[PDB]
Design a protein around this ligand. Structure first.
Ligand SMILES: Nc1ncnc2c1ncn2[C@@H]1O[C@H](COP(=O)(O)OP(=O)(O)O)[C@@H](O)[C@H]1O
Ligand SMILES: [Mg+2]
Length: 729
DNA sequence: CAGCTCCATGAT
DNA sequence: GCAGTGCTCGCATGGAGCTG
DNA sequence: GAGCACTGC
């Protein structure tokens, strides 16, 4: 917990921003005259040395202090009057406004134009994916080491990079065996504090190059020098005046070759230059609305801020920007739908009331909602693009079927789409035996079907009472007709379009097995007016998920021999490292019923194979290619992911999903190797996560969206709304 | 199994 | 394009988690 | 000293 907790601690008092900060916290709650007066005592830092800033302030701190000796109203206008000025202040002072000129040059150079960079660095730098120069901005720091704050000498906190100050009087160098030692030492006045260097002599020069002045030293502390008194190693001792080395300064990815001090001076010398050249992107009317910097400065800020406030204002600008890009394209779609327009219709509680009472089980207040929502949106004078989202076995299917009656019941006909012929056939059965009948004629049209039959069908649709067609994105590729088509159901990712009747829009509905938390929903997809998400069905018991060490792997192996001997089946997934084949017939020392599926060898008659698994031809399987949310092998009691977490926390879900059906009270182990905490911190979490959305919650908070590549927004969301509003035009 | 990075140590 | 100043910044090794 | 800019031939 050490690091993750110490700098954190000694990080509140003593620097304008922190100050301003707190004061805002001050008001947003309650002053404390007393207090202020003690914050001001602790202030320290170069920013303050501005006249107004100082004058400007008094005025301020003076206005505030009055709060308390003030009844209710007397307090308000008082407050907002403030708050406004802080931000007012912050904007004035806290940012290093990049005042620009000379003139822009602007392309993708092969980076040698870069200054300081040269041949070998050329190659070095490209190990970081840095060609071009745009390449040299879109490349922001790992992190930031700050400094501004200077520690006193004799308060060195045992074991920590600090930056203290003082003279320096002592340049000794010591040689031993396979080691030297360079020392000079720093003298506040009273204290004197060893400051030691290892296999560097040069330093000798500089330090001597120096003896005289007082300076700023930046290093670490060490609990040794068993003679006592702490010893500071590794520092930097810059001559000084450092109003200008009492700054935040970045930390970039490195690459044997370069050094921070290197890489830095290299950003130090170009960024200001480049930044400057960037045609603004979003219009000035916006900017003004919400208040964070154009670009130049923003990009500026990500490298060389002087207020974490800066940096904040910089991501914030830099991130809204790129959500804009999305929500722009969205409406820009959503609108085009407003053109072509949609169609509604009336609806007979008849059907559903029937369907619903027909079933055995209950229904959920969830699916109920799925329902109230679909109807209504279909009904509405325009399109519907809902997303029926849920978690394998939540009741997605049912619901779809109501969509299917309601639409039929209305007047028009629906058209089910699905990635695979094998899946079509299979779905078909259900919608019918499901529809168990009433009075609806539903088809499939899959190319397997005999040419005539096709014909009898096609024609069936061109006119009349073929009520639903079940097929692949086969339909759309041949060019079918029917002059009423009131909806299109979809299952999932079909490889790699919308439908219009005469010219209006077709009620579109898309179901998915792999959840996605609302923000991500509303941010990469959003355009799917909604997602009526599911909260799950009863009687439903769930996978006893277990996590198992390796070695004991032959343990699980056996557990199957059983369950599988008692008539069940077992997946076995092994990522990438041929071994597979080696993993295979060494696994027919599990002699018994095995099948393979290399995977991305990806004919998507993968199901071809699963069918055959579900039918009972490969007692057990063998992965690679994380199997998908598809044809469902019933008997499959147990699952086995190995050397995981290479798998997102979701593919694993996928996998867990795939095994259970029945009640079957299925089971899924996961062999592990070594790895650790953060890794297993996660797994551990998986296993007890009854619920696959709090999964995504959790996949986000930890690894950024693995599911090209977002530069900037790690869930704060006021943006994703800041969007909707500004984000029409 | 390897190739790289990042971090912490190295001296009586 | 190579040859001569004059800058800035320069340890090395070993175990470490990470991705391929 | 490595790497690079910059100046000159
Ligand atoms: N309300 C319910 N209560 C109990 N079982 C239900 C309920 N709704 C659906 N089921 C059944 O439980 C399983 C749910 O999965 P399903 O409805 O096929 O959709 P999906 O797997 O896509 O979520 C099916 O057997 C379905 O028939
Ligand atoms: Mg389904």
């Amino acid at each position: 917990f050490t690091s993750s907790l110490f700098l954190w601690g000694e990080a509140l008092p003593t620097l304008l921003e922190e100050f301003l900060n707190e004061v805002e916290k001050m008001l947003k709650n309650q002053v404390n005259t007393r207090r202020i007066h003690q914050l001001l005592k602790e202030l320290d830092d170069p920013l303050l040395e501005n006249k107004d800033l100082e004058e400007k302030l008094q005025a301020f701190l003076d206005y505030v202090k009055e709060i308390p000796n003030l009844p209710e109203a007397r307090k308000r206008y008082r407050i907002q009057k403030s708050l406004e000025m802080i931000e007012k202040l912050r904007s004035w002072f806290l940012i290093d406004y990049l005042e620009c000129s000379g003139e822009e040059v602007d392309l993708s150079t092969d980076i040698q134009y870069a200054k300081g960079v040269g041949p070998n660095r050329k190659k070095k730098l490209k190990k970081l994916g840095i060609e071009t120069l745009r390449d040299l901005l879109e490349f922001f720091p790992r992190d930031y080491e700050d400094r501004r704050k200077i520690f006193k000498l004799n308060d060195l906190l045992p074991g920590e990079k600090v930056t203290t100050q003082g003279k320096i009087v002592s340049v000794e160098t010591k040689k031993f065996q396979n080691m030297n030692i360079l020392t000079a030492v720093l003298s506040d006045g009273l204290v004197h504090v060893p400051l030691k260097w290892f296999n560097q002599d040069y330093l000798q020069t500089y330090l001597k190059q120096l003896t005289g002045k007082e300076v700023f030293v930046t290093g670490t502390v060490k609990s040794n020098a068993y003679t006592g008194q702490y010893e500071i190693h590794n520092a930097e001792v810059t001559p000084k005046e450092g109003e200008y080395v009492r700054r935040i300064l970045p930390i970039y990815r490195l690459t044997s070759g370069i050094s921070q001090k290197q890489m830095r001076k290299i950003f130090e010398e170009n960024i200001p230059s480049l930044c400057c050249s960037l045609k603004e992107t979003l219009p000035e009317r916006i900017l003004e609305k919400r208040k964070l910097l154009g670009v130049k400065d923003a990009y500026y800020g990500m490298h060389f801020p002087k207020t974490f406030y800066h940096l904040e204002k910089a991501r914030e600008r830099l991130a809204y920007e790129e959500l804009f890009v999305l929500q722009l394209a969205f409406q820009k779609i959503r609108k085009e739908r407003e053109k072509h327009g949609g169609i509604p219709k009336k609806i007979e509680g008849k059907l559903a009331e029937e369907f619903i009472k027909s079933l055995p089980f209950k229904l959920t207040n969830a699916q109920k909602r799925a329902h109230q929502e679909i109807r209504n949106d279909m009904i509405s004078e325009k399109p519907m693009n809902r997303l029926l989202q849920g978690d394998v076995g939540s009741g997605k299917t049912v619901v779809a079927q109501l969509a299917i009656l309601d639409n039929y019941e209305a007047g028009f006909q629906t058209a089910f789409m699905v990635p695979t012929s094998i899946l079509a056939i299979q779905h078909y059965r259900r919608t019918v035996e499901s529809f168990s009948k009433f009075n609806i004629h539903v088809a499939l049209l899959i190319g397997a079907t005999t040419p005539s039959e096709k014909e009898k069908i096609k024609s069936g649709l061109r006119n009349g009472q073929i009520d639903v067609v079940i097929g692949t994105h086969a339909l759309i590729q041949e060019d079918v007709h029917f002059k009423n088509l009131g909806l299109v159901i979809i299952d999932e990712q079909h490889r790699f379009e919308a439908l219009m009747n005469k010219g209006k829009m077709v009620d579109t509905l898309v179901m998915s097995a792999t959840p996605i938390p609302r923000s991500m929903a509303l941010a990469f997809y959003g355009d799917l007016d909604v997602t009526v998400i599911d909260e799950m069905p009863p009687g439903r018991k769930e996978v006893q998920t277990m996590l198992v060490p390796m070695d004991r792997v032959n343990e699980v192996y056996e557990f199957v021999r059983q369950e599988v001997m008692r008539g069940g089946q077992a997946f076995i997934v092994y990522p990438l490292i041929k071994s597979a084949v080696e993993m295979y017939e060494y696994l027919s020392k599990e002699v018994f019923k095995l099948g393979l599926m290399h995977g991305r060898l990806s004919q998507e008659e993968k199901d071809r194979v699963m069918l055959e698994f579900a039918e009972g031809r490969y007692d057990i399987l063998v992965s690679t290619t994380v199997i998908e949310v598809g044809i469902d092998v019933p008997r499959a009691n147990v699952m086995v992911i190995e050397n995981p977490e290479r798998f997102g926390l979701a593919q694993l879900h996928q996998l867990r999903g795939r095994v259970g059906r029945g009640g079957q009270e299925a089971y899924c182990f996961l062999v592990v190797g070594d790895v650790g905490e953060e890794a297993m911190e996660r797994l551990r979490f998986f296993t007890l996560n009854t619920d696959g959305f709090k999964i995504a919650e959790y996949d986000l908070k930890t690894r950024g969206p693995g599911e090209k590549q977002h530069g900037l927004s790690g869930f704060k969301v006021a943006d994703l709304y800041r969007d909707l509003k500004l984000l029409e035009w």
